[PDB]
Amino acid sequence: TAKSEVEDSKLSIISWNVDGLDTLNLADRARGLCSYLALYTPDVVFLQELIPAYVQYLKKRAVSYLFFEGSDDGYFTGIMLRKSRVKFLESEIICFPTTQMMRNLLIAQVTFSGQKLYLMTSHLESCKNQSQERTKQLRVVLQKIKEAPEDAIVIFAGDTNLRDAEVANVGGLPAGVCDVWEQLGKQEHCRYTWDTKANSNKTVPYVSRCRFDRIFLRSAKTAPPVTPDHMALIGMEKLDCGRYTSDHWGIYCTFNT
Amino acid sequence: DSKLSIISWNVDGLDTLNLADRARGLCSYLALYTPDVVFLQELIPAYVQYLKKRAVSYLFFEGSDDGYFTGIMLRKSRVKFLESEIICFPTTQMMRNLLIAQVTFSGQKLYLMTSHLESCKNQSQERTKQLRVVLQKIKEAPEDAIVIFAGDTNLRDAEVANVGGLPAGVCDVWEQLGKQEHCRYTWDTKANSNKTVPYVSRCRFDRIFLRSAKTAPPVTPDHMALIGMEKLDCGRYTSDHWGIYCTFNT
DNA sequence: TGCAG
Ligand SMILES: [Mg+2]
Ligand SMILES: [Mg+2]
Ligand code: NA
Ligand code: NA
């Protein structure tokens, strides 16, 4: 098939923890997010730390998307699906029994470019000290990826809060599942998604750089595998209010679907 | 000595075993450290009756008149009192509140605050609401005041993060001083045997938040230590919490 | 008034 039919069949996603818990300039920052969505027109958006006012705003502005949320109050995750590109089939939420932070796993099954996709997001248990709970949640996520319908491509994207050796400590990713940043070459340029030296939204006594935001991919077991195409960190511009959209950078990523 | 000093301590007044001896222990610490300000939580009337009898160098403010409550003690020779107030927590189920005393310390205004935020792991909702109030008050305190909040926050991992973090200009003293491991945990069931429990739990419930005045150069914490981790004659610790001693460069 | 690594 020709170049343009191929470029049109490519899936695009954005994953972003929007820091809805930071009340400062929140309306301006939601406007910022919307400007990025208009720029990148992603097929799927995976969001974390939404709060009701924020998602209400998005639903009023981003009317070309269908919305699903991980909760109706507090703070929660969301999946947005571009209606002209992605056909919604069904959704569900899987609970994390031992979370103290209302965390869970939000799943949407869809059709895209003639293929079934299983789209997942979570905001895994926060803070270094919560390595144990986070790890448990990671296991659930990975199990759900392994077990997804054999004919589906699985894409999890979210704020994993994972740090050094936590994945290695569960034996690494299972066969058939890759971390997209790893698969694209472990590039330093687009590695850290939370960087308190570079991002001035929070004042912090000690700076750190972490790769909290991650994308895991599993191809269909019954079809040829798909590769990621390209990834970039986004949101590294300040808004008119003099702050960034979030204390995280977003990930923009395409796949050769 | 130009350095301001404070002690903050949840005295566990709800534990009545050896309470008199334990209040004596606390008084021994006050006599040694002679802090300018003492922030206390979980006082009960008997306990405070004792302290007021003994610590005559201090002016007392109490957060309630019965049940259990907080207190602020001011060293009369070092601190001049201006005014006090209590901010209520409308949805507390445990009579928690925010006790505030405004004072001057060699001419510099201090806005002193204490609270015992809603207790128990599962009360994170109410606790976080209360934390919001506290932080907002710290934010709104008079520009010419140094603000010191010290108290039993009952705070967990991410509860501060899940509120948006501390506001600009406001620091956690333990963090500011380098997250030193030896003055980290203030409630430690392994190291403290006052509570009979089977499990090990180690938490940083007791915290100090600091904001400078704009009318003066930034205040930095200088030295912090945990106190009370030695048994009294009665064979028990002063409290199930360790106390915090802290000095400031003003 | 149930950790952290
Ligand atoms: Mg956050
Ligand atoms: Mg207690
Ligand atoms: Na490609
Ligand atoms: Na000192």
Side-chain angles (χ1 to χ4, degrees), chain B residues 178-196:
Chain B
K179 304 191 182 186
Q180 302 168 87
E181 268 291 321
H182 70 273
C183 59
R184 186 178 190 190
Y185 310 112
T186 69
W187 194 77
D188 183 329
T189 66
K190 177 153 185 181
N192 189 306
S193 62
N194 269 25
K195 275 191 160 179
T196 307

Side-chain angles (χ1 to χ4, degrees), chain A residues 10 184 227-230 254-256:
Chain A
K10 273 187 191 176
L184 289 172
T227 52
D229 164 56
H230 169 258
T254 53
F255 303 81
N256 295 310

Side-chain angles (χ1 to χ4, degrees), chain B:
Chain B
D1 175 86
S2 65
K3 291 187 189 159
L4 174 72
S5 65
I6 70 170
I7 280 177
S8 185
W9 210 335
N10 176 324
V11 308
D12 199 10
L14 293 176
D15 176 11
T16 62
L17 184 45
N18 298 108
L19 199 57
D21 290 316
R22 289 164 41 226
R24 276 194 281 282
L26 170 65
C27 288
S28 179
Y29 283 97
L30 301 183
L32 172 59
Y33 284 83
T34 59
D36 299 314
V37 186
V38 193
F39 305 88
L40 296 177
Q41 307 81 36
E42 216 171 297
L43 290 170
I44 61 166
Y47 199 104
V48 77
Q49 187 174 333
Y50 186 83
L51 298 182
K52 290 186 286 191
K53 204 117 43 191
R54 162 95 74 103
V56 301
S57 289
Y58 291 88
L59 168 59
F60 287 70
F61 293 86
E62 301 167 40
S64 185
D65 66 333
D66 212 338
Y68 63 97
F69 44 83
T70 58
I72 295 176
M73 301 171 54
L74 303 174
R75 190 148 194 112
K76 293 179 298 182
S77 67
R78 294 264 292 175
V79 164
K80 289 198 166 68
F81 173 75
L82 297 178
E83 65 167 280
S84 61
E85 76 182 296
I86 291 174
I87 304 289
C88 296
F89 289 158
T91 53
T92 182
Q93 291 290 329
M94 308 181 185
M95 292 295 156
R96 309 304 175 78
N97 57 24
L98 177 58
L99 169 62
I100 296 170
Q102 304 190 236
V103 307
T104 63
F105 168 71
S106 289
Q108 166 65 51
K109 184 184 296 184
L110 313 179
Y111 192 88
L112 307 169
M113 306 165 69
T114 197
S115 189
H116 182 193
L117 304 186
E118 209 81 348
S119 299
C120 303
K121 186 171 182 170
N122 77 347
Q123 292 303 315
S124 55
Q125 185 171 9
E126 174 55 21
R127 175 161 62 250
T128 48
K129 281 177 165 41
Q130 297 176 350
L131 173 68
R132 294 191 181 266
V133 174
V134 169
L135 295 177
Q136 185 61 30
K137 292 296 158 176
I138 292 175
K139 230 175 61 157
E140 300 174 345
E143 251 190 0
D144 65 338
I146 291 164
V147 179
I148 301 178
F149 170 88
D152 178 2
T153 66
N154 275 302
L155 282 168
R156 258 75 175 190
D157 295 341
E159 292 175 348
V160 178
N162 302 342
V163 92
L166 301 173
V170 183
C171 75
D172 175 314
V173 169
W174 175 75
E175 294 183 342
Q176 199 53 42
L177 287 174
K179 304 191 182 186
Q180 302 168 87
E181 268 291 321
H182 70 273
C183 59
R184 186 178 190 190
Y185 310 112
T186 69
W187 194 77
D188 183 329
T189 66
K190 177 153 185 181
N192 189 306
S193 62
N194 269 25
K195 275 191 160 179
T196 307
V197 297
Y199 51 86
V200 173
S201 184
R202 291 180 257 150
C203 313
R204 193 168 67 89
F205 286 157
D206 301 274
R207 307 188 182 189
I208 308 171
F209 300 140
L210 171 70
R211 190 210 80 178
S212 303
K214 299 298 311 179
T215 52
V219 179
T220 57
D222 193 42
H223 169 254
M224 174 191 165
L226 300 185
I227 58 179
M229 64 267 273
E230 177 182 285
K231 293 185 183 161
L232 305 174
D233 288 339
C234 67
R236 306 192 77 227
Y237 298 98
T238 299
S239 173
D240 66 337
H241 286 243
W242 309 135
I244 295 168
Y245 173 70
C246 192
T247 58
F248 299 87
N249 296 309
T250 65

